[PDB]
Amino acid sequence: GMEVIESKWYKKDGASSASIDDVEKLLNTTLPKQYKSFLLWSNGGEGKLGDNYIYIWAIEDVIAYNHDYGIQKYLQKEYWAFGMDGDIGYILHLSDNSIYRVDLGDLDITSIKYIAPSFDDFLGKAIYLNFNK
Amino acid sequence: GMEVIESKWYKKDGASSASIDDVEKLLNTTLPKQYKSFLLWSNGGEGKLGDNYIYIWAIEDVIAYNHDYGIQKYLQKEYWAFGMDGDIGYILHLSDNSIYRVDLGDLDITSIKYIAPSFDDFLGKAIYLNFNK
């Protein structure tokens, strides 16, 4: 029968122009358009989208988290973590916008799990698909 | 500062695969994969995703609704409505999976408005973009 499904987002203020420019300058490349669009709305935040707890980092913190978790080191330079759910990291590819899940405690290029072709697609899937399976 | 954004989907029982196949047979075409995946989860339903009220049709009703609103008559055979919000129709393009908005009361190929490249992308956008702009 009918079931009430929720997606809740605890929205932060949006990212400033300077904050986005700073990270693009440091990366020496562009952020994926949809990820940037989300950040301009909510600069990080956290929520429960369907069954999925997702914690997204403020753009000012992304470089430091990526260094701490060793993302580029174990993956390659195109892959950047943007959030997490405990052991699980959420990663994007800077060029093709694809989204993956990884075990932050066992990072391996061969084991990254593709979940969506882009950021907005990810957000939409989340309402009806449990990424923990 | 922080703001609680919700969304809710009033989920129906999933569509039978057979019921989806019946429509594909009748249309002599394949439906977009993401749309089918959503139907398998919820065979229509309605919700408020961000600021957006969205009412999605059960698969068994889609052909009759498309006929009644004259979607193919006014648009093209490649465009199929899957839902609405009052005057607004939500349409998919069979050839490339994209999602559009139209005014059901003023259907015209020249005035269809692109909103997303796929169904899941559309759902994700809805959480943070108000399509009534």
UniProtKB/TrEMBL annotation, chains A, B:
Pfam families: SMI1_KNR4 (PF09346)
Domain of life the protein comes from: Bacteria
Annotated SUPFAM superfamilies: SMI1/KNR4-like
InterPro entries: Knr4/Smi1-like_dom, Knr4/Smi1-like_sf
Record Gene3D superfamilies: SMI1/KNR4-like (3.40.1580.10)
Protein name, as recorded: Uncharacterized protein
Organism (species): Bacteroides fragilis (strain ATCC 25285 / DSM 2151 / CCUG 4856 / JCM 11019 / LMG 10263 / NCTC 9343 / Onslow / VPI 2553 / EN-2)
Lineage, opening ranks: Bacteria, Pseudomonadati, Bacteroidota, Bacteroidia, Bacteroidales
